[PDB]
Amino acid sequence: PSGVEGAAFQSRLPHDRMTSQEAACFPDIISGPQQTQKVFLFIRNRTLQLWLDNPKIQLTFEATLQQLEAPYNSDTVLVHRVHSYLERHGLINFGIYKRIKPLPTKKTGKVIIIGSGVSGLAAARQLQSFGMDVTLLEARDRVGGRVATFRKGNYVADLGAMVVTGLGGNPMAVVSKQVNMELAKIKQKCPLYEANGQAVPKEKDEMVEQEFNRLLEATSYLSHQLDFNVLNNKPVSLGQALEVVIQLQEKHVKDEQIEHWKKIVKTQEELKELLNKMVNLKEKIKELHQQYKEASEVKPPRDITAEFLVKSKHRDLTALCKEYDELAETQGKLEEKLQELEANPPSDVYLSSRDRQILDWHFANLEFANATPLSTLSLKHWDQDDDFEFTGSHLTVRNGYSCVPVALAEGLDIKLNTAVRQVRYTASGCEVIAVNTRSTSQTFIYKCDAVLCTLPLGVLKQQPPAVQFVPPLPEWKTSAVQRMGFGNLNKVVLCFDRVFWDPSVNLFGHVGSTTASRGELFLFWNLYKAPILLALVAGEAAGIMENISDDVIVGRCLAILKGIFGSSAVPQPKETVVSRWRADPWARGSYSYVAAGSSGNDYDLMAQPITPGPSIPGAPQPIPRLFFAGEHTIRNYPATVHGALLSGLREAGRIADQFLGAMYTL
Amino acid sequence: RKPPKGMFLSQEDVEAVSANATAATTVLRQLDMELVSVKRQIQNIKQTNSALKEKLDGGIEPYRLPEVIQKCNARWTTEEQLLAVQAIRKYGRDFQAISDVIGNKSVVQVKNFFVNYRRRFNIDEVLQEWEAE
Ligand SMILES: [C]C1=C([C])[C]=C2C(=[C]1)N([C][C]([O])[C]([O])[C]([O])[C]OP([O])(=O)OP([O])(=O)O[C][C]1O[C](N3[C]=NC4=C3N=[C]N=C4[N])[C]([O])[C]1[O])C1=NC(=O)[N]C(=O)C1=N2C(=O)[C][C]C1=[C][C]=C([N]C(=O)[C]2[C][C][C]N2C(=O)O[C]C2=[C][C]=[C][C]=[C]2)[C]=[C]1
Question: Domain ranges in chain A?
Fold first, then answer.
């Protein structure tokens, strides 16, 4: 869309209706008359628009009002109410802008934010933007978390997030404007090379891909249409379903071959019966002939009964000859029909061995995308977030995604090398206990009104706990933690003195020989100004590869490419980096996924904040104290940078509403 | 609402591959084998049929007899009548044969004949005799 409606859309909101959230803040309006709803919407939309149209500077109520026109410039509270809603909830004046009203003189409230991810960073800025006092604590010696970007020389390569999945309705769009990140579209063409090192004929390539897509929908069909979602008391993985579907396709092939050859035998049998009939006829004919021959021996002139024999015998013999000529007729057809059936054997197989392997690459890809084995993915829910896909082509960040965190981090109180160990929340407030990463023994205590936790789900899942909650988190929280899935995916980075591959092409695939190793180095990216080739390890491979020397890993890397580009062409790489996120203590994986037996609703449970019990018994119910953000907390945008960022904006608003009160909801 | 084109997924089938860990392979093997049995069975009949073909070799062409062309003349020779009666006796009602044997009478003529001489050839008697066999 374009115009104001564009702005709604670019803000992930329906232009013509009020959201559940708006309903909560403007319950007067939405229970109100349609006319007013319409006004509201326009104001909201318009207001969005102006921010969007310029996001490098703060959009103030005055400015906003200034540009509105009556009827709409008519009601100033409505405007102000709206503008503040948008502002509180990060719909505007979020990211990096030039402040018009310099910062509130004295701050109010104090929040401790665990983790300097994008989730953290974004919340922190938001809060600070709201005059709160915020400190971040990060175990690492840098910001950005799983936005990790490697820089050396003019080498640049993200080990972390790499891609921007579409700018249509993506917050990073604004951030892009707000920051010079150089964005590069990703040319879709990706060519595959079997283990031999031979490209894969366009023909097979398209055949298989389409089967793959074919195969996916199939699963969807079982899931919804046959409701094949539980098997033997346990939930069905997308992986099981694919197997079942495949088996079934194989069954069908057999099934059809059988039926074909069965058609043959029956035809072949039917002919057999004809022959017999034919052979006997010849028998009778042969003999009848004799008899005629004999009777015609009796030379005329003959008595009548003797004349009769000849004639009658003669007739009988032509009869049979007629009868048999017919069969010879029939037999001809049958012979020929059998002749066609051997012509048109139904397909020999569902998939060649070579066929299975290209397919596997496609499955590795899915595994790369979801950062997990499809065995683990929920059949029913693994793509639940599919509806909220952005629009536009995918992009990569030519200068390294880290620029973003870094940019976000500017202006903020961040403590690096500080590892949280314990979070205590109680009615009066919270204390967070951390240590210096460099020397464990040196200890810090931070007191604050609220804690925002952006520890990764991986970290949350750790047994025994890397971080301790006091009191322990409620079971509803912790079960969701068990249930959700935290995947793994790894990058290997190869830096070269010269480009030896097609610059025209962004990415290309290698096809593994085994199904077990479809993950292993299955895909390669060239995205950077330097000569850098980046290679994914995905699927079950990822986990396993983590226990293997970089050198070996690089070995396989070079191998593969020598095969593809010829052994003289592939120089030793000047610089190499390999990642191992499941290993990383502050990540313990790459991103969340919907494990089989979980659902999107778990994501919602993770975002639900925690309210400590009363300090003195029978004192009234507190404020909540412990808040969660991060990629694993946002059901509609899980597992992404924009998702994390959004979560962070979310909680800041929630927190601000709580500790600063929201004066806009009457 | 419907499986993607040429994907086959049936309630019945699905339950069937599902039922135990190896059930999938069980069913695939049953067919793998089952098919082979048909394949072989084909080759028998192929061989069988081939041998029958050999017997039938040479067609019947040696045993064919020249066709005769008979103008479907109006009159009955006594010879012609005599043949008829005999024909009846051998051939029941199959008037086609009978015309065929007499060689120069219309099939009508035969029935034509039948009623016509029924009296003096006791065709009833003849018929019944021909019946008794
Ligand atoms: C790992 C990783 C890698 C390697 C790669 C990647 C990733 C990852 N991703 C994700 C991201 O990264 C994330 O999410 C973010 O970053 C998050 O953040 P947060 O939450 O904030 O967190 P962090 O960062 O971690 O932070 C935290 C902190 O904390 C701390 N700590 C710990 N512990 C502790 C601490 N402190 C203190 N104390 C203590 N104790 C730490 O340190 C830290 O700092 C991604 N994303 C994105 O966006 N992008 C990208 O690219 C990236 N990557 C890649 O390559 C992949 C990913 C992805 C995936 C998927 C997607 N998509 C989706 O999902 C979907 C949805 C709907 C649609 N879609 C689509 O379309 O797509 C598909 C695709 C795939 C692939 C490619 C393209 C496309 C996206 C993405």
Answer: 1-109, 110-235+352-666, 236-351
Q: Residues of B with CB below 8 A from A317's CB?
A: 63, 65
Report how far residue A191's alpha carbon sits from residue A40's, in angstroms, rounded to the nearest whole number. Answer: 51
CA of A644 to the centre of ligand 1 (A): 8
Yes or no: say if B65 and A317 are a contact pair by the CB < 8 Å rule: yes
Which ranges of A546-637 does DSSP label H, i.e. alpha helix? 550-565, 600-607
Q: What is the CATH number of domain A1-109?
A: 1.10.10.10
Establish whether domains A1-109 and A236-351 are of one fold: no
Task: Name, in order, each residue with C-beta under 8 angstroms of B27's C-beta and a sequence gap of 6 or more.
Answer: A251, B16, B17
Lookup result for tokens 């044969």: B97
Q: Distance of alpha carbon A96 from its chain centroid, rounded?
A: 29
Closest CB from B4, B27, B64 relative to A217: B4
Helix axes B95-102, A304-341, angle to 10 degrees: 120
Are A235 and A379 in contact, with CB atoms under 8 Å apart? yes
Return the domain boundaries, chain B: 1-133
Residue of A536, A622, A521, A645 lying closest to A124 (CA atoms):
A645
Q: Which atom of ligand 1 is nearest to the CA of A388?
A: 67
Question: How many beta-carbon pairs below 8 A join chains A and B?
Answer: 137
Task: Write the CB contacts of A405 (distance below 8 Å, at least 6 apart in sequence).
Answer: A116, A117, A118, A121, A143, A144, A145, A147
Q: In Å, how far is B96's CA from the nearest CA of chain A?
A: 10
Phi, psi of A164 (to 5 degrees): -110, 115
Q: With CA atoms as reference, report the closest residue to A538 among A516, A559, A554, A560.
A: A516
Q: What kind of fold does domain A236-351 have according to CATH? A: Helix Hairpins (1.10.287)
Contact flag A248-B9 (C-beta cutoff 8 Å): yes
CATH number 3.40.50.720 is the correct assignment for the domain at B1-133: no
Give the span between the Cα atoms of A26 and A36, in whole angstroms: 11
**Residue A650, annotated ligand binder?**
no
A413 in contact with chain B, both atoms CB, cutoff 8 A: no
Q: Which residues of A touch B95 (CB under 8 A)?
A: none
Joined tokens for residue A498: 């010269």
User: What count of other Cβ atoms lies within 10 Å of the Cβ of residue B70?
Assistant: 12
What lines the ligand 1 site, CB under 6 Å?
A: A 114-120, 137-140, 145-147, 160-163, 165, 369, 385, 389, 394, 419-420, 454-456, 459, 466-467, 489, 491, 581, 586-587, 590-591, 630-631, 639-641, 644
> Are A251 and B31 in contact (CB < 8 Å)?
yes
